[PDB]
Amino acid sequence: RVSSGRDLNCVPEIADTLGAVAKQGFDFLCMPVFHPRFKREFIQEPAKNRPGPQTRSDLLLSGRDWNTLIVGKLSPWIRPDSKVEKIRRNSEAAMLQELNFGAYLGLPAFLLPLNQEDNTNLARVLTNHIHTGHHSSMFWMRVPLVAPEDLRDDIIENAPTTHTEEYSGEEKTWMWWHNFRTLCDYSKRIAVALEIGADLPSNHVIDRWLGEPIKAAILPTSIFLTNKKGFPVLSKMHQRLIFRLLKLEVQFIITGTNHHSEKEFCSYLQYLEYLSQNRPPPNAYELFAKGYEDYLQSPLQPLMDNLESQTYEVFEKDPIKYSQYQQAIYKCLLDRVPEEEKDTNVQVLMVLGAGRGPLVNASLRAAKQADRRIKLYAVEKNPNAVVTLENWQFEEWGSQVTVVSSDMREWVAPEKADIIVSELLGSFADNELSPECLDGAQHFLKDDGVSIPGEYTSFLAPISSSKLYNEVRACREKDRDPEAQFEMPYVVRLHNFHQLSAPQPCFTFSHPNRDPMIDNNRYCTLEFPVEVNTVLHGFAGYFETVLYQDITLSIRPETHSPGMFSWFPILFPIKQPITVREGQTICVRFWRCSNSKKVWYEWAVTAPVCSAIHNPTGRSYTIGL
Amino acid sequence: LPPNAPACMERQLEAARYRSDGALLLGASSLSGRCWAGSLWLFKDPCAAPNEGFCSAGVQTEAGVADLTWVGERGILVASDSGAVELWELDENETLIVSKFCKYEHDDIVSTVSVLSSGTQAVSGSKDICIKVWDLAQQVVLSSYRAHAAQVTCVAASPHKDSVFLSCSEDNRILLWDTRCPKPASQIGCSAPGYLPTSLAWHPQQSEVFVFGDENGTVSLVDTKSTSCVLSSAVHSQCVTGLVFSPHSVPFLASLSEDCSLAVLDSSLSELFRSQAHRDFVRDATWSPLNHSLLTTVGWDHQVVHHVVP
Numbered sequence: 008r009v010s011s012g013r014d015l016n017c018v019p020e021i022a023d024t025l026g027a028v029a030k031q032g033f034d035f036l037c038m039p040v041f042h043p044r045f046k047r048e049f050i051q052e053p054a055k056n057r058p059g060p061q062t063r064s065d066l067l068l069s070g071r072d073w074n075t076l077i078v079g080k081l082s083p084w085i086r087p088d089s090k091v092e093k094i095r096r097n098s099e100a101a102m103l104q105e106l107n108f109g110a111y112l113g114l115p116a117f118l119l120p121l122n123q124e125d126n127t128n129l130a131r132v133l134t135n136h137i138h139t140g141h142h143s144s145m146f147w148m149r150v151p152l153v154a155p156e157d158l159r160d161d162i163i164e165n166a167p168t169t170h171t172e173e174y175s176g177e178e179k180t181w182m183w184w185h186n187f188r189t190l191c192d193y194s195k196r197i198a199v200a201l202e203i204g205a206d207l208p209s210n211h212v213i214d215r216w217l218g219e220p221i222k223a224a225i226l227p228t229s230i231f232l233t234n235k236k237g238f239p240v241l242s243k244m245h246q247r248l249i250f251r252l253l254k255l256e257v258q259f260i261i262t263g264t265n266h267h268s269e270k271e272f273c274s275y276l277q278y279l280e281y282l283s284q285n286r287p288p289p290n291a292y293e294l295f296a297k298g299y300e301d302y303l304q305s306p307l308q309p310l311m312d313n314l315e316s317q318t319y320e321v322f323e324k325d326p327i328k329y330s331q332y333q334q335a336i337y338k339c340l341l342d343r344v345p346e347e348e349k350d351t352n353v354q355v356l357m358v359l360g361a362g363r364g365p366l367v368n369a370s371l372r373a374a375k376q377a378d379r380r381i382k383l384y385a386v387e388k389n390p391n392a393v394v395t396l397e398n399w400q401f402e403e404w405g406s407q408v409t410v411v412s413s414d415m416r417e418w419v420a421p422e423k424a425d426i427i428v429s430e431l432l433g434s435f436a437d438n439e440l441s442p443e444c445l446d447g448a449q450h451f452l453k454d455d456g457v458s459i460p461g462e463y464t465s466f467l468a469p470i471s472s473s474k475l476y477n478e479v480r481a482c483r484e485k486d487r488d489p490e491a492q493f494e495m496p497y498v499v500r501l502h503n504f505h506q507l508s509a510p511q512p513c514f515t516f517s518h519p520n521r522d523p524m525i526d527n528n529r530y531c532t533l534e535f536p537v538e539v540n541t542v543l544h545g546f547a548g549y550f551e552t553v554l555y556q557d558i559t560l561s562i563r564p565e566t567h568s569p570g571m572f573s574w575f576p577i578l579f580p581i582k583q584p585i586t587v588r589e590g591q592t593i594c595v596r597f598w599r600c601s602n603s604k605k606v607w608y609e610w611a612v613t614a615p616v617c618s619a620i621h622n623p624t625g626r627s628y629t630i631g632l
Numbered sequence: 633l634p635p636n637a638p639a640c641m642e643r644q645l646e647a648a649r650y651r652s653d654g655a656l657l658l659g660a661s662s663l664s665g666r667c668w669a670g671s672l673w674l675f676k677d678p679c680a681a682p683n684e685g686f687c688s689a690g691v692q693t694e695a696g697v698a699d700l701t702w703v704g705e706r707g708i709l710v711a712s713d714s715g716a717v718e719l720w721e722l723d724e725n726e727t728l729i730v731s732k733f734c735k736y737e738h739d740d741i742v743s744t745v746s747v748l749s750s751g752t753q754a755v756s757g758s759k760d761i762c763i764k765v766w767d768l769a770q771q772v773v774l775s776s777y778r779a780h781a782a783q784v785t786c787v788a789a790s791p792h793k794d795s796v797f798l799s800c801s802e803d804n805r806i807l808l809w810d811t812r813c814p815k816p817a818s819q820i821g822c823s824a825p826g827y828l829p830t831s832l833a834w835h836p837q838q839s840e841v842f843v844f845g846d847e848n849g850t851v852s853l854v855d856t857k858s859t860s861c862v863l864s865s866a867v868h869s870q871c872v873t874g875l876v877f878s879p880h881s882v883p884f885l886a887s888l889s890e891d892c893s894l895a896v897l898d899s900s901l902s903e904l905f906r907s908q909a910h911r912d913f914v915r916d917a918t919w920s921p922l923n924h925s926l927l928t929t930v931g932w933d934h935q936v937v938h939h940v941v942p
């Protein structure tokens with residue numbers, strides 16, 4: 008259900024306090040590691056020689072407790088960006104001291120505020136801590152949705168509050184975060200503790216945070232309403248934001264005193280549990296896609312590589328998908344053989360890339376449904392899968408099915424085909440080289456023959472995710488180009504991201520391809536109107552295919568085939584994030600390129616700014632032919 | 633050692649307030665070690681302080697004491713680390729100190745408290761950025777103001793106007809409050825933004841003049857009337873933590889800083905006297921009602937020093 012912490016700025020006894028917050032049901036405690044009011048002097052006599060101890064003992068908890076139950080807090084007097092030099096020097100020294108104590112204790116996380124625009128020296132000091140030994144602990148930057156200056160009551164007669172709307176001004180808190188994390192060079196150890204107020208901002212202000220690395224949400228007791236029975240509760244709007252944050256699986260922190268003193272603080276926590284248990288339940292896909300959120304994978308290349316047994320197993324575990332294939336073949340058989348010719352007319356059905364036979368079985372269930380007659384060739388280049396096939400045909404299919412162990416481009420077919428059926432599509436449609444494979448096979452399709460699928464189309468959409476940017480960046484490897492990670496696609500269950508524009512079609516292929524001169528190379532220019540301020544990190548890819556007439560398959564969200572957990576989207580990264588202002592257009596260029604040896608994609612952003620061309624001559628990424 | 637009086641007083645001396653009869657209110661926190669709490673002490677013999685065995689009365693608080701004020705002659709109003717404003721009452725015999733009320737209204741440390749001239753009302757300031765007005769008899773919050781945009785450093789009630797008080801914040805705002813105004817707050821100070829304001833004291837005679845200290849050791853004299861910075865002196869090498877006026881006809885001004893020094897200034901803000909007595913932060917100063925030449929300072933060095941001002 009919900010992982011929740013208590014935030015305190017007062018800890019008389021750490022043992023008792025920890026006991027109390029545990030009894031209330033809290034998983035962890037955020038607290039000061041030094042007394043919040045204990046300002047320390049590092050430079051000036053005599054306060055510099057203040058006798059210790061400088062704080063309480065590490066002996067007061069077990070190493071396990073320090074490691075698991077405690078998030079440290081930076082002392083509030085520490086101001087490294089103070090304009091007073093002495094305060095800056097003392098604050099630099101105190102910050103290191105406190106961060107060094109946290110690391111001494113093995114704290115899993117440490118809270119630091121972004122409570123103003125200029126945190127340059129704060130970033131410099133934190134970066135120095137991070138580059139002083141390699142460690143795991145997280146820094147939670149406590150940032151408000153709404154800056155406190157923009158939250159203040161309008162009660163200053165000669166300093167009225169500007170109720171006039173300022174789009175970019177209302178997003179100023181995001182820019183505080185952006186600048187800090189850019190200065191700290193996207194450390195994976197630096198995340199957001201997003202602090203929520205009584206007055207939520209405009210949706211655009213909340214949307215600014217969509218693909219950002221939010222580890223915690225801070226809920227003050229102040230923002231909770233009172234139900235008839237006097238229990239703390241939240242406005243519907245706060246509730247909808249909570250449901251968004253539960254999708255991001257953040258940790259919730261309760262801060263402030265009990266303002267519902269007719270009840271214990273577990274009432275605040277129980278309300279959250281109430282909301283979590285009552286969240287609109289997920290979808291089977293969301294259950295299928297449960298462990299894979301933002302997990303980067305290599306796109307499968309089933310041409311160049313022989314897929315493993317368990318890979319085919321997952322392909323096969325989508326009954327909806329093969330119902331569609333069955334339906335397309337069913338429909339196609341009836342169009343091709345009138346009832347008068349049913350018993351006289353036997354169609355030659357060739358499955359090209361038959362794997363372990365799910366399309367063979369679908370083809371057979373189809374022919375019985377249509378009550379029409381079919382001879383099957385099951386062509387498969389993977390000799391490992393041919394074992395599965397040949398056992399199937401010996402035991403069950405019989406001589407109706409001829410297993411062909413061969414590349415469909417090399418195979419000399421004993422006769423021409425009525426219908427070729429194939430499953431040769433990646434998350435970007437043509438990224439497994441369906442076009443080249445089926446082009447190679449089409450000489451043995453009858454002049455009036457049908458390919459299932461007849462057509463497929465790739466789609467792209469610009470996305471924001473500072474999280475996925477950082478995950479890609481982390482895929483640097485020895486013995487190659489230190490930026491190759493950025494010049495290759497990843498299959499991924501995109502989760503913590505923002506789509507910046509509706510998907511647009513990229514590349515389309517048709518089968519059979521009657522072009523007198525056939526060219527599978529492509530160059531496509533796309534213009535994505537963007538209505539938000541944001542940062543571009545890459546392009547989500549999806550596909551749609553027409554099996555036959557109106558029977559389609561899609562992972563494009565607007566037209567997604569229902570139940571088809573088969574296929575996560577693909578991601579094309581860019582090396583340098585690109586600022587996009589509300590109203591600006593993102594222009595991207597995609598090329599599909601080829602040799603006799605390899606096919607590859609190249610891509611460049613040309614608006615509002617130019618990127619480098621990614622993957623020139625397939626130097627970082629190719630698909631083997 | 634009196635009854636209900638702790639065996640040991642916390643090292644960090646936060647506040648020192650002489651009553652009319654010349655008895656001494658002491659506030660202390662434990663700002664380090666296993667236990668982070670506080671104590672309230674009464675010394676009818678001030679020369680005995682801080683020795684606990686010669687105190688008239690002492691009590692332990694749940695948490696540290698950020699700020700303290702006498703409420704009349706038997707009342708002690710406390711700003712706590714807990715976010716509670718606490719009312720403590722002296723005994724009939726004044727042998728013990730007993731908690732009247734403890735109210736958890738502030739969402740963070742209560743940094744500052746001042747009793748309004750009414751004597752039935754107080755203002756608290758907190759790191760939660762809020763300023764609250766208290767009805768002491770009914771033990772409730774009349775109003776809560778989120779005027780400032782950062783933690784509230786000081787609140788000081790006007791001497792004689794029950795609806796008027798000053799506040800200063802790390803938001804760099806000095807606010808003049810009149811609760812009789814629908815928009816109760818009014819931003820005041822020198823035109824140019826200066827260094828952050830750390831301490832406030834109204835003039836005890838002139839109703840529209842006050843002094844403020846800054847994070848840069850500068851003490852400044854302001855007339856609300858002119859709403860312009862009449863006089864400034866660079867008195868300290870560090871933050872000005874406290875500003876206390878003598879009870880004299882023409883009052884002397886006691887200046888205390890994290891530079892661990894005490895300064896006494898004339899009305900022209902010129903330096904008459906300076907004491908390097910303390911070897912840590914000087915927290916408070918209180919002039920004797922009995923002998924107006926006498927100034928008592930406390931510090932985090934746990935020294936109770938008694939100064940003779942020329």
Ligand SMILES: CSC[C@H]1O[C@@H](n2cnc3c(N)ncnc32)[C@H](O)[C@@H]1O
Nearest residue numbers: 309310360362387388389414415444
């Ligand atoms: C069922 S997933 C697609 C299948 O097609 C097979 N395949 C891909 N390309 C070819 C080809 N050119 N000839 C024969 N089988 C192929 C793969 O080995 C895989 O089992």
